[PDB]
């Protein structure tokens, strides 16, 4: 019927003055654009078909051509920024927003999907979709007493499109648009479906990726306990965005961080800091570094939850990017912690893995480590035991590495290293 038409034939059918001929040509275009190996998006665009598709979105009496043109345009809009731009340039945004009210769920859903691709291009099209008024009819689709009565695929598409309206920076989404979306997001964050949860978490992770007032908007909605619960999920597609959101939240104020600690997040980090997925380990350690940058009572809760040995472990053996995050966690800890907290750190075995990382070809981690060593030496001086620490550092090979760094081509490196040798090894 409509499989493997030529673009020439699609054009001839869409140019006929016969709505049913147009419908069949539009379906043929949809099937072309729905094949996976290199759909001819640019050939369709060049044939001038986008404005016809867009005008078909308004044909209320031929709902199949609304559906077929919506799908065709969705797949064009899923392409490069230039292809998405051709869809927007054809007037598609207000036509899709009008389609959100279609009595045919499959057509409404297709408009949701299209708007998600357009908004997902970037900040400017995201904000243009918002200016045309997409948010109110999108949210109205979710204004039911129990989300479980909506079709699963429909709900997943709505969640994904809403997460694209929360996404991207420079600029972040408008504050009022965020406030309007957030209660529906909180509700989706409690829905039982794994993909709805994953995409809800992604949305929250976008919204918390920014200055403290943005984080506060999210935290004051009370979602942190639910984020921590999802941090413990078995599905990696959920843990990844949930951990990202928690990490973002702990880049804020110590009071925001404290919400994360009070919700029980620290009890999941034994698993996270040993997780077989390298990126989970890395982002868990990043999160820990922004918790050891906090107050001494927060550092103390890291101690009480037994996480210091887990930081020793990721410093000892992990992917290098994780090890560097662990170096940051350690210097933050040593810079902010009490003397007894730093003593405890050393008794957990931090010194040797810290020293072994002075062999690394990355001058930034070397600076971080040297700074940590100075902080620890300062605790030792406050205890009159700089010498025992000097011995400990030498007996594990650390001094060789430090003086090797005296002749390092980076400046603050050899300055800090030299300083250390003058002050502590003579």
């Amino acid at each position: 019927g409509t499989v493997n038409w030529s673009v020439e034939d699609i054009v001839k059918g869409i140019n006929s003055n016969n709505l049913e001929s147009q419908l069949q040509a539009t379906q043929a275009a949809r099937k072309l654009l729905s094949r996976e190996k290199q759909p001819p998006i640019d050939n369709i665009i060049r044939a001038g078909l986008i404005p016809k598709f867009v005008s078909f979105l308004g044909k209320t009496d031929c709902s199949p051509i609304q559906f077929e043109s919506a799908w065709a345009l969705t797949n064009i809009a899923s392409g490069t920024s230039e292809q998405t731009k051709a869809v927007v340039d054809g007037g598609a945004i207000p036509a899709f927003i009008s389609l959100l009210a279609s009595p045919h769920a499959h057509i409404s859903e297709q408009a949701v999907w299209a708007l998600g691709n357009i908004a997902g291009d970037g900040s400017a099209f995201r904000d243009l979709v918002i200016k045309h008024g997409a948010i109110d009819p999108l949210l109205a689709l979710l204004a039911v007493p129990d989300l479980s009565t909506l079709a699963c695929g429909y709900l997943r598409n709505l969640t994904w499109t809403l997460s694209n309206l929360c996404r991207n920076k420079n600029p972040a989404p408008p504050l009022d648009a965020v406030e309007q979306i957030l209660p529906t997001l909180v509700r989706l964050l409690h829905h039982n479906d794994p993909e709805v949860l994953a995409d809800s978490c992604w949305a929250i992770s976008y919204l918390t990726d920014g200055p403290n007032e943005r984080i506060e908007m999210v935290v004051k909605k009370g979602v942190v306990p639910q984020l921590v619960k999802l941090l413990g999920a078995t599905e990696l597609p959920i843990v990844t965005p949930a951990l990202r959101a928690i990490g973002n939240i702990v880049t804020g104020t110590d009071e925001q961080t404290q919400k994360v600690i009070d919700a029980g997040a620290l009890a999941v980090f034994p698993s996270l800091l040993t997780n077989p997925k390298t990126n989970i380990q890395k982002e868990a350690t990043w999160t820990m570094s922004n918790i050891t940058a906090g107050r001494q009572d927060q550092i103390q809760q890291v101690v009480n939850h037994g996480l210091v040995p887990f930081l020793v472990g990721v410093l000892s053996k992990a992917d290098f990017k994780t090890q560097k995050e662990a170096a940051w966690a350690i210097t933050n800890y040593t810079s902010g912690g009490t003397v007894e907290q730093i003593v405890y750190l050393v008794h957990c075995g931090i010194i040797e893995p810290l020293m072994n990382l002075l062999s690394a070809k990355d001058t930034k981690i070397i600076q971080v480590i040297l700074d940590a060593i100075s902080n620890i030496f300062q605790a030792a001086e406050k205890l009159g035991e700089t010498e025992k620490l000097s011995i400990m550092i030498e007996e594990c090979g650390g001094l060789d590495k430090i003086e090797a760094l005296q002749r390092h081509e980076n400046e603050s490196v050899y300055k800090a290293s030299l300083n250390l040798i003058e002050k502590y090894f003579s």
């Binding site: 729905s34 799908w71 899923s78 392409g79 291009d121 994904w160 996404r167």
Partner: peptide, 6 residues
């Protein structure tokens, strides 16, 4: 970020 319907 973007996804086609297949």
């Amino acid at each position: 970020r973007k996804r086609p319907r297949v």
